[PDB]
Amino acid sequence: VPLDGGRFATSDLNDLYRRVINRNNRLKRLLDLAAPDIIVRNEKRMLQEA
């Protein structure tokens, strides 16, 4: 949080980062399960959009 007086901002970058990193691990994890490739495609798509 900036906290530099006044109302406080959210510096939302991390959030994307957060969710971004999230999907990454998911991808691996699901690859780690030998997932049905249709849904691995889906997760690749999620990562790309992220």
Add this chain to the structure above:
Amino acid sequence: YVNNKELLQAIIDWKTELANVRQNDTIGLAIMLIAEGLSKRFNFSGYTQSWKQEMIADGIEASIKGLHNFDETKYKNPHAYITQACFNAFVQRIKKERKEVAKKYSYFVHNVYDSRDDDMVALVDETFIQDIYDKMT
């Protein structure tokens, strides 16, 4: 959406094959389908697209792993199985995120010593009151 019966069929079949590696995707497409359809349920589908994406991600992986074990002789339906599976996955994800941003609020309210005089009273009480409400749980 999709005939529950044919899903019973496909899963019986992957059972039989796992009695021998992969599984068919018919059932997997249907899983995506049912997850996304539940997403449009009424308690959810209420707040935030961005969250909802990750929610459904959670639920999908949960159903994926949890398909491993599904009796047929009992629980003659896989539909509701996956349904409640994803349901729980969702609530898990959402509680995590809620208390995360709660943590953010908590960190915030512990900093009023910025520069000089002339503080505010109105807002701070509200960050406080939320940071309390969430903490109630």
